[PDB]
Design a protein around this nucleic acid. Sequence first.
RNA 1: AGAGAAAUCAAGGC
RNA 2: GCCUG
Lengths: 241, 662, 453
Amino acid sequence: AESECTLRALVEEYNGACKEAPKEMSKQFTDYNTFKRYTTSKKDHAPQMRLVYSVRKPWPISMTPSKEIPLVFNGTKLKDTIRTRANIVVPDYWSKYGSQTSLEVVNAILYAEDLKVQRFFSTEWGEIRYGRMLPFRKPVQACPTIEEVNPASIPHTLLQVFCPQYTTLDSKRKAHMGAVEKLKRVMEPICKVQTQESAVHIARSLIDSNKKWLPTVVDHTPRTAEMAHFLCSKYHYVHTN
Amino acid sequence: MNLFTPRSEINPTTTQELLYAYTGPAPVAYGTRTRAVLENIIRPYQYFYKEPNVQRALDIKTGCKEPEDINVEGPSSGFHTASVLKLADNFFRKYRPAMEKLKYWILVKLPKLKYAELSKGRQTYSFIHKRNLPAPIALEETVEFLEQNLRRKIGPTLLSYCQAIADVMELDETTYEGREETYTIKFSREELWDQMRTLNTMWKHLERGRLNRRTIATPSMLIRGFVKIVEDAAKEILENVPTSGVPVGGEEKLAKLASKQTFHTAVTGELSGDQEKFNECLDPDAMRLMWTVFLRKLGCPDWIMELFNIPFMVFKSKLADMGEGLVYTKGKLTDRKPLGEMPSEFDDLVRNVVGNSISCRLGMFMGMYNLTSTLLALISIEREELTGSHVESSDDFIHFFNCKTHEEMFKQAETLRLTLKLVGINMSPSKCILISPAGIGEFNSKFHHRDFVGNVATELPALVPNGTNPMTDLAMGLNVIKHSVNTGQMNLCTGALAMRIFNHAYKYAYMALGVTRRTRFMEENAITPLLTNQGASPVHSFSTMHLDEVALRRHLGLLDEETLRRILNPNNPVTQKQIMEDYSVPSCFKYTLSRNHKALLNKEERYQRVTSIINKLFPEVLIQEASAPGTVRESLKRRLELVVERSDLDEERKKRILSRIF
Amino acid sequence: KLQFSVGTTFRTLLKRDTDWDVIPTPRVEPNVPRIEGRRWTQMKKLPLLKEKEGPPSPWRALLLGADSEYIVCPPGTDQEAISWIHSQSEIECIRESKSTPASVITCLTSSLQSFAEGNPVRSRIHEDIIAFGINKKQEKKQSASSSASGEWKRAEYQVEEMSLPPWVEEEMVLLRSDQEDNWIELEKNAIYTEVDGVAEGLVDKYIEIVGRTKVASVIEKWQIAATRTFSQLHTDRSRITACPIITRDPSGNCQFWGMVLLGPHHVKRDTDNAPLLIAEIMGEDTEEKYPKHSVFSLKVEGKQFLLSLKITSFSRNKLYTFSNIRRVLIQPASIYSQVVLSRAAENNSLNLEVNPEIQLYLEGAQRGMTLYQWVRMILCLEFLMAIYNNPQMEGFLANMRRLHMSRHAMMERRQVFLPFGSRPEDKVNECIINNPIVAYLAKGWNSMPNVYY
RNA sequence: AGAGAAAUCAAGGC
RNA sequence: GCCUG
Ligand SMILES: [Mg+2]
């Protein structure tokens, strides 16, 4: 039933697209790359300056037209039903009274961050040293990754993980098999149904090992390069495992 | 100032960061830029000849002069053709691996460049609406104009875009047809040429370290493809040239040169300086000649040379935007009048005046050809008597001489100065300082002392939330402080203090510090503060500047399973969707603030809906660049049919769904 | 024709303002000629900056600096403290400057009264026309139009050169005076590693060093005033808004530094200037230092204070920048930390309770001073520079970094050589016009020796 | 008035 | 006289 409802909604959206945007619908598909970044807002150069005013507005947050959030709670007006508008207290209220998702979803979302936290807390630190140490910056891997996957094959790996049936066989043989297998294993529960926008980013952060210029008193492994921001500062050197 | 000059414990070089008064407001340019633009336009003509003859210099098409005309006691505004050719040949012969990498880039990477990247540029002056519009809007308008006039579909590649731009120039006339309002505008060939060659000039705002304000210039979208191609080639060649500081971070090469030493017998010297009137003393013809020499010696075909030379030639016939006009005062009143209405210090240019733009041949403008200017400066160094280590970034430069005697060092420094003049670059005599023996200097805000290169930022990190949302703002601020810490600027104490200040500002910005609506609401409902933006104590530390707030709190036990389930619930209604990565998890606190010509906002909303439907229906465009043979309609129809026909629903339900499709 | 082709018409268009074809093929034999160069002279002695001559530079900052004071009030809310101050007040004019007429005091009191009822926003009555320059642009334009005669001339702008005022030294001296309580209160970060502990200890020691100074109090006052004015910048846009500067002492007693009013501002751009009627408590009044302020005598509980009114106009960007004024603490901190971290590196043992001797070119017989005093003075000078940051300061510092590097090179007996016709002092001097802090820095530079053997 | 510095704000458009 | 900020 859910699939049928989603397909009906997609058909309604197709009607809206073909009826309201006949001119845009006839442009080249690659033209997407041009108008996916379409934006009339200028480069503000100072959103932090307007943040204070925006937060203190009567209805700063824009929320989807949901029904779980009551219109009025303990006298406070939580939402403005005409996407509807809601005040900054809504996220705080949701943190106490709100719908609860499965623990599997929570584990999947936090997989990268939880792994980073465990990696930080799963290692010991040696006696901190002090001296005239020269921190010659070098380009090293930023964060440890699931498996060694070439940057060229990263998009193919993501495609195989998410929608393997929409890619060519030659492309199917351009992605790491272990990485795709385990990423599909850990990203399966609910991250791979509709919340693809964040799931793809999490997967990329898991497999994509971006190189960065970091200070290295000694040769740095990705595990150390993750936390190199405090291992050495030209005046000290903390030795890890 | 005597306080900033220690003679014990630490050295004055360490106190250099004290001379940076960035904590105060940055200067902002006011009102008209016509005076600055006109001064920039006139400087090359004044400096072309030793005697400031402007009328005679204004008649020069290509600015080239013999060495006798080159000014040694002042700036020069021209180049020597034979010297440019010889220096380009020497540069090609010296850095052959870089030339081979450039050849590979041309033969492989260049054809695959998509013009969609042009949407990532700065503000562009649209020649259709006669207004400044963002890069995506100008690019879409230009592509539509090309499609309408050429009666063909522009290819996804950038070379196809350049070919279309060249083709539309042949037509005698062009036409463009665009709340609801229909309007058709017709341009002549000369009008389109003027729009293509016209530059848009604007004040450079919030620039520090300068007493006098200066302007920057940007080209029109018509010529942005060629400029992008040339700049990409320049970046590719520069990334493999040891003498450069733009793409390699700058600090690495300066540190490498600092680490170098000698046999404590050879005379060493360190010349650090800038170039005076760098952009007002370069001729585009010199750069195009250098590029032609590079390509010709590379064996490239004729069309490549034509493509690389077109942008420089179009820049030669530039129509700089004067702006609002010059200011005149009849006592206490003030009026703004364009050049040529009343006598002024720039009367010599009244001849080269158009409706509101001034035609200029000699000189350039800052912010348009940076990598090409760097290459022009670098080819000069490739002499037979310049055995030293030179690093140049656009304008700043540092040269390490290692000679056998002081007289040889002076001769080499003078040879460097004269060669830079030869190409058309004048090192500022006042801002150029040579220190012997070497071991002290500055370059690109990085100060080198003996064997230590300390990086000093032009501005301290903005210890304020960006303005997106609590989680994203916290992650971005922590990442910025971490980047400042690991780049050598901030140490343990400075980093921790900056984090404390940022935490205070971040808590204040989100109404979680004193008695506010958020805190009062949380207290009245017994909502225990669990996150930093909620008023809870800062869980982050100096070591844990990279861990996520939610993950760290969960590990420490500050967040329980039920709270995490309620927060990270993907069904909550308050979340939707280079060196600024954001690794914050999509929690309920990752919301968006409601931020709130009429014929363009509707188009933007329509495109937003189209891209949203594509994203939900095409679960492949978020992983790879969009690509499919055909238009949007064909691909969307195929994908929708495949999705619907692959479902497990019964035949009747499938037919019901399909029938509703328009 | 292969991949890219240029038509004949476009070729002719391109070959319009150049001497070569689309592919330049100049017919010249490539070689590098020899040009008669010049001699590279040596900077035997460091230069001396130009000390301007003119009227002493007044205090042109937004709020008061070292002279700022506060009134102690019983613990309570800002409304309670404002009501307590207003109820017991005998404000009377003492020195009325034509720039800030004394009548404008009526605006301040009417605001305080309005703040004692719980409504900071107040409506204009009579005195806001001159207090905030309402409809002043039209008046100036009409006056200029009615007095128009002559011929248009290229507008000439001149910056009135001024000399070093004698109050910069006094401000520097009074800014580093010790206080009773700590004025820097920042929530500490969590500690999970020895590195975190060391960083927190260093930050705590720095705050202890610079926390109990007058400069810290002035920084807190500036931060509070800027934050409260910037926050209430679009509250009403048509009525006078009250933004009192009130702090809480550890005992809980309120401290009233002053009062900032916002006029009926009509702000469109981010660089526009909104009017203000800053009213602040002084400690000592000098006519030559505050020629535009108007000083009144305010009596509270028998005690007497001076209240200075100024008619200012400040931009949104400047208010936002001064809201985050705490960043001024970052620059000195590093210099302190490095010194500490310099002592730990030479013996592989950290020591937070270390303040070695820093030698300096001091006017008196003193050879130098201690790390704590030097850091306090650095914080004071950096705060003054930040307050007085304008294009003159930017250019002066940018062009004085070169001379600082040259001085450091001379200190190590490194010969500094210069090109032909080079005058870095010429670049530095053009930035010395009015800025009193720039003049103070130039005097300090001139004080130090210019010859090193 | 005032802010400010090489030209603007001290409200603009229709 | 109407309206944005
Ligand atoms: Mg330099």
